[PDB]
Amino acid sequence: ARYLGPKLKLSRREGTDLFLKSGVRAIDTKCKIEQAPGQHGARKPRLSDYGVQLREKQKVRRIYGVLERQFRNYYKEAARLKGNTGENLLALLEGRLDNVVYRMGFGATRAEARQLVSHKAIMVNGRVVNIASYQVSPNDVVSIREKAKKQSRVKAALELAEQREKPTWLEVDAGKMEGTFKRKPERSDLSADINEHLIVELYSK
Amino acid sequence: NIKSAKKRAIQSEKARKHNASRRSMMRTFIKKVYAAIEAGDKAAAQKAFNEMQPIVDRQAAKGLIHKNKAARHKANLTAQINKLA
Amino acid sequence: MVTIRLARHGAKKRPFYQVVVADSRNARNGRFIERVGFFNPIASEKEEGTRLDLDRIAHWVGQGATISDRVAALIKEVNKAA
Amino acid sequence: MKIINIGVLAHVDAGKTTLTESLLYNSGAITELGSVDKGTTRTDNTLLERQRGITIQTGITSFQWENTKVNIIDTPGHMDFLAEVYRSLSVLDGAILLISAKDGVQAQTRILFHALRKMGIPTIFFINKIDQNGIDLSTVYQDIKEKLSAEIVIKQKVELYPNVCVTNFTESEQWDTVIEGNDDLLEKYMSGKSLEALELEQEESIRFQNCSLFPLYHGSAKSNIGIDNLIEVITNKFYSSTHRGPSELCGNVFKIEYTKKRQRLAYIRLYSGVLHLRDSVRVSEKEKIKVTEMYTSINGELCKIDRAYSGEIVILQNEFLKLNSVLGDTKLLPQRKKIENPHPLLQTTVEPSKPEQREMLLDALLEISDSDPLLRYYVDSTTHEIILSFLGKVQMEVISALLQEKYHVEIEITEPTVIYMERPLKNAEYTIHIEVPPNPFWASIGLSVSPLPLGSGMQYESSVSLGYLNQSFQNAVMEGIRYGCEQGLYGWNVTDCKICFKYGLYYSPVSTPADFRMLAPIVLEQVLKKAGTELLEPYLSFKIYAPQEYLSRAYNDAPKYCANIVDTQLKNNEVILSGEIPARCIQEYRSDLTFFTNGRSVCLTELKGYHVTTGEPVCQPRRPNSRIDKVRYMFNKIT
RNA sequence: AAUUGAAGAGUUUGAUCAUGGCUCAGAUUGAACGCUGGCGGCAGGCCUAACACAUGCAAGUCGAACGGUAACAGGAAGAAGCUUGCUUCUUUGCUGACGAGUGGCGGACGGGUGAGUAAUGUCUGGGAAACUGCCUGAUGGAGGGGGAUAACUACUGGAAACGGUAGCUAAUACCGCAUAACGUCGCAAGACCAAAGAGGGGGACCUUCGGGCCUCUUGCCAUCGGAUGUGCCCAGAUGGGAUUAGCUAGUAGGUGGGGUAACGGCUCACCUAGGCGACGAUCCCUAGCUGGUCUGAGAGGAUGACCAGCCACACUGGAACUGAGACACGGUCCAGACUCCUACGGGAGGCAGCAGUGGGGAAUAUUGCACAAUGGGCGCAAGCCUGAUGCAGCCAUGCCGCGUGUAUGAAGAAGGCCUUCGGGUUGUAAAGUACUUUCAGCGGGGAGGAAGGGAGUAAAGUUAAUACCUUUGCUCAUUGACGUUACCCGCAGAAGAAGCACCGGCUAACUCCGUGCCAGCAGCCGCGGUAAUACGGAGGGUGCAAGCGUUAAUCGGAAUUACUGGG
């Protein structure tokens, strides 16, 4: 399932910053970003249309930690929905519990959030949940159980989130780790950098 | 095959015995009638029909005859014995 | 003999009966005249528990359809005064 | 609870299996034929056995006496494929040799007896065929003592006449040396005074557990005298079965057989615990294997059983069952193993009859592999000729009759491949030429093969200077020379070669490693054409051990064999000599020692020394070679 | 709100442009094979031999139909010990009950398989000349007699299987007779047609003390209904082959007789000579059909495994019998092939029921637990029966979820690989440091599937009756195969858990060394004859992930069968 490999090499491959080692400290410069994918990282790729499409899709997947299969499922789920596929895919990827928890600041990186959720520290609507793929319905209330509340890591990990942009589609108690998911996030809120168009393309063929 | 419910076999034979016998006597009275018809003795014909009617209704009531076959015998047989009478 | 009976369907370990009028010789999940409501044993207390279209049932009662024990119990549970 | 296993070492055609049949009769009935002369039931089982006048393999038969189980097997003492009988030693703790009245125990019996001494398990002597002329009433037993090399003493005495004495003895005063070996019996003997026979019987049981000496026996089964009470001795004297049921269950397969209606049956003993019917069980393959069916092989008829008792032996069907496979895991036992002391007892060819039936016949050979563990074969020949590891004269008759029975194929061969190796006669210059005078490829070289000392093998050197040799070019010439070593002009394999490459002209634009590599073989065949060749044959040493009295006569075998005389030495009554004869005639040497020794002969050998030379006419075995490009050019070179 | 939907690429040439095949990118699978493999959830699991099958089980039930009583448990006349009522113990259907037996019902359902079938089937829609056990509505009847036989005893045949003669007996079995109508026939007159009773409780009355009588319950017979189920009929549609053009004599129609529940050449007698066919009859090959499944923008194309309806078959061929319903999977008879038994005289068998075996095959599971739940059979009910069903075992076979740790961590180490030897890269990766415990391991708690049914009690109905009975509340005792359940809590420690394919172009991702048109690779085009980006290894990278590849198969792309949509 999980990637659990060099969570910073991927960031180099995508050339940007997947925030995989977003970590406690801020900006890295501890990996030689951009111009170092690997042994032949100095190469400038000819980069075929397919190339940019695939590259895009992977970037996005590596952001949210979703694998190929589950992803394609999300896609089919986006096509079967109303509105427009582009906004959909990212709204559903945004709906994942590990993602929302991450946004709340409950954990440093996203994988940290995942490891938190999986071990029953997270409790939404009083109903404790393990699955990260759990889609958080609008007007829910995610929190942290008392037996796992303010247990070292979560504290500093939440001190980190103060420098982040912080979503307007969700809120946090900060006083007792009692967050509150609200509306479905608008497209012009998240991303504005990762391109949904190319992803829609890739599965269109 | 070995099966305790094989009583259906011996009983069904013990039944085809009796039932077959009755079916026989019935159809033989009917024959008696048909012969009466062929002879042209409308009187003896009517007689034989009177002699057989109760024994066909009686066997039709016992499920031996479907009381369609009984009405059928009574139908056309009468059409004959009275067409000549 | 027409009879009203639960049809046991749904998932494994998660039974969902569909009360239905059908010939007694018919297979349980087999052929039937018409389904008439449903029973949900593991539903507990929520938005739904057990629907049952009493009109058609009553149509089959005066039609000679023998109600099975469970379905009878349901006819009781939906009551006529509760 | 259970019952101890009993052997049947009827060495030299002792006929002890018939004694097993009569014992099967005495243990009866209550409903049995009682057997008959010859075959005859007696758990003969497979056809071609009783019809052959002797069992082709060891059998099994359930039996009971003295209120206890009494499994027994026979005979496997014939020939000849006796290794399966050695496999039988794992299948039972007990033993019961059938001593001949002819000059004591048979010399063939002595091998199985000494092997029984290797077994570490108890056994008892039996004076079979007591009802016959020339019986050793006081002579053959002495041969039993001189040959046994132990301390066995008769438990009973008899002579006849129509006499059939058994319990009347035995060994008053003089008997009790086995008790003398024990510290306790030695102590009571130190005490002096006469004592009850049971009191020495305890020490006799103690030494008997160690198998310090074989129990006495007498009387012939044919006379129906002593054939019963001796079985009682087999029942009481036999070691108790290790009953338990504590678990966990464990054991191992002893033997398996392919019944025509089987189609297969894997016999196995319960070394510990018990296996419930229709239940999963461990396997040596590390995979689950349910016991779908199993049943005891009763002598009157096979019978099913719901479960096996601990220490019990029983056949069972299975999807798979390798020989000596663990049934636990796992049983832990230590014992020596051997198979007639030979890798192969003179392998013989077995080419199948008919264009297509022989291919099925190889599958029949696989079925032979399914049977007795002591057999092997492989298509080492390029023609895929068979070469059975099976040995002995009568055993070949057994495999052949089995081929004529269960299968529908047969073959007649014995010579096998000569395994000859040609060697160069003398050094000579040669060259493929240069450019294309000529034939493709344009690459060419001046090979210069030279004579080499015998057994030196192929040899070569890169005399050519770089870069004309090429860092990755000359190696193709070497591999090509090896390709030319694959067969000589006579078709014999190359040997003692010394191919020193010299010239190597080539043109760059058209030169390829494959071209020069093709050129090499032409240089090899060319040098071979000028060498004159010389045949070479194997001459493996052949050590032999025969009795000294026949040792002079064995010298007469020397003149009859190509093998040279060699150093040898005496070993007690035994005599030994280090032979050295060619493999081509070595196969008959076993028949020669077998004939001269009167079956007392024994020998061993191993291949060595490729050098030898042979005559006459230098005959060679075709042929090489085909299925490779460039051979047509080689045919062009000849003319 | 409820199909918002259609992509192209490589390869013919020196190059182009067409034409035109081939091939790839997708989805799919009842898949197999190779490598690897931790868990859970829900499904699926002999597509080949309709091959042959050891063994167990898969259909019984009713003592509220009957004579019985072979066991068992209680009761009684009597019996023996001895603590004379404590025990021993023979009779006794007299009760609780229940083998064998008669009778009723079921066994025509449920389960399997798809051989046969090109229409005698199926689907769609109509139709009339029918029947329909059980269930149910309405209206009446339910009077009075007889003769048998199984069991059972006596004897006797047969090795068994399995009887035979002679006696005794019962019924809701069987059978006349009375009895009848809006029932059957007939134009009517008229004629004829049926049956059974059992169980619970009971005041008076009546008792030859067998009980009569009263009442509730149920079953019985007739008719007309209702519902359901089944039979039948027609039209349309439902594979390929014209290198199959003619086929047909019960054949096509008629008339009459028989026959069927019912129409009908369904079957005979005679009469007429017709009937079908180029809008493909006959013959041939293949095929169960359908709802649907897969694919596809759609039209279509392929398929019809699981689920559900229908049809066909039950070792092979044939036949009828019983019954409401079969011309019958675990019935009968007959023949046959094939297995086994035998005392050789004769008998037994039918796994396309569930497991299981051999054989076939690339290939597919336990000789499980239980009737607790749903349904069926029977029964008043209790219960019994149930390989249906519910679960469990098994297999990565598929879909889906999760885990295999997260954060920090430059000396930017060792080793590896590369290099212009300056360095790079593997690499925040590792070790280190700080936390975390899901999931497995271990120990405790613990839902829900259970509704009922039984015992008791009060009430309202029933009724001569505060009795029984039916119904409703109400009390106690309870009913779980799954099941060491789900789920929660606690314990320890990063602790037990990552592979597979690929890296010339198509197609995401490159180098070094080994080999030298050899060894090899290859879906296509092609590489190898030189520091091969194409072979083999290594390093690195990419893809996917408990899987990843390969192969087979269908559709798509393919407007390359074009109806939409071509020449």
CSV table of C-alpha atoms (C1' of nucleotides) in Angstrom, one decimal, chain E residues 178-372:
chain,number,residue,atom,x,y,z
E,178,A,C1',-80.3,-45.7,1.5
E,179,U,C1',-79.5,-40.5,-0.1
E,180,A,C1',-79.6,-36.1,-3.4
E,181,A,C1',-79.4,-30.9,-6.0
E,182,C,C1',-78.5,-24.8,-9.5
E,183,G,C1',-74.1,-31.8,-10.3
E,184,U,C1',-73.6,-35.5,-15.3
E,185,C,C1',-76.4,-37.0,-19.8
E,186,G,C1',-80.5,-35.5,-22.5
E,187,C,C1',-84.7,-31.0,-26.1
E,188,A,C1',-87.2,-32.2,-22.0
E,189,A,C1',-89.4,-36.0,-19.8
E,190,G,C1',-86.7,-38.5,-16.8
E,191,A,C1',-82.1,-41.5,-15.4
E,192,C,C1',-78.2,-41.9,-12.5
E,193,C,C1',-74.0,-40.1,-9.1
E,194,A,C1',-71.0,-39.3,-2.8
E,195,A,C1',-69.1,-39.8,2.5
E,196,A,C1',-65.4,-40.7,8.1
E,197,G,C1',-65.0,-39.7,11.6
E,198,A,C1',-61.6,-38.7,15.5
E,199,G,C1',-59.6,-35.4,20.0
E,200,G,C1',-60.6,-32.1,24.6
E,201,G,C1',-64.0,-31.0,28.4
E,202,G,C1',-68.9,-31.8,30.8
E,203,G,C1',-74.4,-30.4,34.5
E,204,A,C1',-78.8,-32.9,34.4
E,205,C,C1',-80.4,-37.2,32.2
E,206,C,C1',-79.2,-42.1,30.8
E,207,U,C1',-75.6,-46.6,32.2
E,208,U,C1',-76.7,-54.4,29.8
E,209,C,C1',-71.8,-49.6,33.4
E,210,G,C1',-68.8,-50.7,26.0
E,211,G,C1',-71.1,-45.5,27.0
E,212,G,C1',-75.4,-42.8,25.4
E,213,C,C1',-76.3,-37.0,25.6
E,214,C,C1',-74.3,-31.6,25.4
E,215,U,C1',-70.6,-28.7,23.4
E,216,C,C1',-66.0,-26.6,21.2
E,217,U,C1',-61.9,-28.3,17.6
E,218,U,C1',-60.6,-30.7,13.4
E,219,G,C1',-61.0,-33.9,9.4
E,220,C,C1',-64.8,-36.1,5.7
E,221,C,C1',-68.7,-35.8,0.6
E,222,A,C1',-71.1,-32.9,-3.3
E,223,U,C1',-71.5,-28.3,-6.1
E,224,C,C1',-70.4,-23.4,-7.6
E,225,G,C1',-66.7,-20.0,-6.8
E,226,G,C1',-61.5,-17.4,-5.8
E,227,A,C1',-56.4,-17.9,-5.9
E,228,U,C1',-52.4,-20.5,-7.6
E,229,G,C1',-50.1,-24.1,-10.7
E,230,U,C1',-50.0,-26.8,-15.1
E,231,G,C1',-51.6,-28.5,-20.3
E,232,C,C1',-52.9,-26.4,-25.1
E,233,C,C1',-53.3,-22.8,-29.4
E,234,C,C1',-51.8,-18.8,-32.9
E,235,A,C1',-48.6,-14.5,-34.8
E,236,G,C1',-43.8,-12.1,-34.6
E,237,A,C1',-38.9,-12.7,-33.3
E,238,U,C1',-35.1,-16.5,-32.1
E,239,G,C1',-27.3,-19.7,-35.5
E,240,G,C1',-24.3,-21.0,-40.0
E,241,G,C1',-24.3,-23.7,-44.9
E,242,A,C1',-27.3,-23.4,-51.7
E,243,U,C1',-20.0,-26.4,-53.0
E,244,U,C1',-28.1,-28.7,-49.7
E,245,A,C1',-33.6,-27.7,-54.8
E,246,G,C1',-37.1,-29.6,-54.1
E,247,C,C1',-39.3,-32.2,-49.7
E,248,U,C1',-44.0,-34.7,-47.9
E,249,A,C1',-48.5,-40.0,-47.9
E,250,G,C1',-51.1,-39.4,-41.6
E,251,U,C1',-48.7,-36.6,-45.8
E,252,A,C1',-52.8,-31.5,-46.5
E,253,G,C1',-58.2,-31.2,-45.9
E,254,G,C1',-62.9,-33.4,-45.2
E,255,U,C1',-66.8,-37.0,-42.9
E,256,G,C1',-67.7,-40.3,-39.2
E,257,G,C1',-66.1,-43.7,-35.1
E,258,G,C1',-62.8,-44.1,-31.0
E,259,G,C1',-59.2,-41.3,-27.7
E,260,U,C1',-57.7,-36.9,-24.1
E,261,A,C1',-58.7,-33.0,-18.3
E,262,A,C1',-59.1,-30.3,-23.0
E,263,C,C1',-58.8,-28.7,-29.1
E,264,G,C1',-56.4,-31.4,-32.8
E,265,G,C1',-54.3,-36.9,-38.0
E,266,C,C1',-54.0,-37.2,-31.4
E,267,U,C1',-55.5,-42.5,-33.8
E,268,C,C1',-58.1,-45.8,-37.3
E,269,A,C1',-62.2,-46.2,-41.5
E,270,C,C1',-63.3,-44.1,-46.2
E,271,C,C1',-63.2,-39.7,-49.5
E,272,U,C1',-60.8,-35.4,-52.0
E,273,A,C1',-55.1,-34.5,-53.7
E,274,G,C1',-53.5,-31.7,-51.6
E,275,G,C1',-49.6,-29.2,-48.1
E,276,C,C1',-44.7,-26.8,-47.5
E,277,G,C1',-40.5,-24.1,-50.7
E,278,A,C1',-36.4,-19.0,-53.3
E,279,C,C1',-39.7,-13.6,-47.7
E,280,G,C1',-34.5,-20.6,-48.2
E,281,A,C1',-39.0,-26.1,-47.4
E,282,U,C1',-35.8,-30.4,-46.8
E,283,C,C1',-30.8,-32.0,-45.7
E,284,C,C1',-25.9,-30.7,-43.1
E,285,C,C1',-23.0,-28.6,-39.0
E,286,U,C1',-23.1,-26.1,-34.5
E,287,A,C1',-26.3,-24.6,-30.2
E,288,G,C1',-30.0,-25.1,-24.2
E,289,C,C1',-33.2,-20.1,-24.5
E,290,U,C1',-34.1,-15.5,-21.8
E,291,G,C1',-33.7,-11.5,-17.9
E,292,G,C1',-28.7,-10.1,-18.4
E,293,U,C1',-22.7,-10.0,-18.5
E,294,C,C1',-18.5,-7.6,-21.2
E,295,U,C1',-17.3,-4.0,-24.5
E,296,G,C1',-18.9,0.4,-27.1
E,297,A,C1',-20.3,7.9,-27.8
E,298,G,C1',-24.2,5.3,-29.9
E,299,A,C1',-25.8,1.8,-33.4
E,300,G,C1',-23.7,-2.4,-32.7
E,301,G,C1',-20.1,-6.9,-31.7
E,302,A,C1',-19.0,-11.0,-28.5
E,303,U,C1',-21.2,-13.9,-24.6
E,304,G,C1',-25.2,-16.1,-21.5
E,305,A,C1',-20.3,-18.4,-15.5
E,306,C,C1',-22.5,-16.9,-10.8
E,307,C,C1',-27.9,-14.6,-9.5
E,308,A,C1',-33.4,-15.4,-11.4
E,309,G,C1',-37.5,-17.4,-15.1
E,310,C,C1',-38.3,-21.2,-18.5
E,311,C,C1',-36.9,-25.9,-21.1
E,312,A,C1',-34.3,-30.8,-21.2
E,313,C,C1',-32.0,-34.9,-18.8
E,314,A,C1',-31.3,-38.5,-14.5
E,315,C,C1',-26.0,-45.4,-16.5
E,316,U,C1',-28.0,-46.6,-21.9
E,317,G,C1',-32.8,-47.7,-24.7
E,318,G,C1',-38.1,-48.5,-23.9
E,319,A,C1',-42.7,-48.9,-21.3
E,320,A,C1',-46.4,-48.0,-18.4
E,321,C,C1',-48.3,-47.9,-13.3
E,322,U,C1',-49.5,-45.0,-8.7
E,323,G,C1',-51.4,-40.0,-8.2
E,324,A,C1',-54.2,-33.5,-8.1
E,325,G,C1',-49.8,-33.4,-10.6
E,326,A,C1',-44.5,-37.9,-13.4
E,327,C,C1',-45.0,-41.1,-18.2
E,328,A,C1',-41.0,-39.9,-12.4
E,329,C,C1',-32.7,-38.0,-9.9
E,330,G,C1',-32.1,-41.0,-4.5
E,331,G,C1',-39.9,-45.5,-7.6
E,332,U,C1',-41.6,-50.0,-10.8
E,333,C,C1',-41.0,-53.3,-15.0
E,334,C,C1',-38.1,-54.8,-19.5
E,335,A,C1',-33.7,-55.1,-22.4
E,336,G,C1',-28.4,-53.7,-22.7
E,337,A,C1',-23.4,-52.3,-21.4
E,338,C,C1',-20.6,-52.2,-17.1
E,339,U,C1',-19.1,-53.4,-11.9
E,340,C,C1',-19.6,-56.6,-7.4
E,341,C,C1',-22.0,-60.7,-4.4
E,342,U,C1',-23.1,-66.0,-4.2
E,343,A,C1',-24.0,-71.7,-0.9
E,344,C,C1',-24.0,-70.3,-8.3
E,345,G,C1',-30.2,-71.7,-7.7
E,346,G,C1',-30.1,-66.3,-7.9
E,347,G,C1',-29.4,-61.5,-6.5
E,348,A,C1',-27.1,-55.9,-6.3
E,349,G,C1',-25.7,-51.3,-8.6
E,350,G,C1',-26.6,-46.3,-10.9
E,351,C,C1',-22.9,-39.5,-7.2
E,352,A,C1',-25.3,-34.6,-14.0
E,353,G,C1',-27.6,-34.4,-4.6
E,354,C,C1',-23.3,-32.7,-0.9
E,355,A,C1',-18.6,-34.1,0.4
E,356,G,C1',-14.7,-37.6,-1.8
E,357,U,C1',-11.7,-40.8,-5.4
E,358,G,C1',-9.5,-42.4,-10.0
E,359,G,C1',-9.2,-40.6,-15.1
E,360,G,C1',-9.0,-36.5,-18.2
E,361,G,C1',-6.9,-31.6,-18.2
E,362,A,C1',-3.2,-25.4,-18.2
E,363,A,C1',-6.8,-25.6,-14.7
E,364,U,C1',-10.9,-25.3,-9.9
E,365,A,C1',-12.1,-26.6,-2.7
E,366,U,C1',-13.7,-29.9,3.2
E,367,U,C1',-15.3,-37.3,3.2
E,368,G,C1',-16.8,-29.6,8.1
E,369,C,C1',-20.7,-27.7,12.0
E,370,A,C1',-25.8,-26.9,12.7
E,371,C,C1',-31.0,-26.9,11.9
E,372,A,C1',-29.9,-21.2,15.9
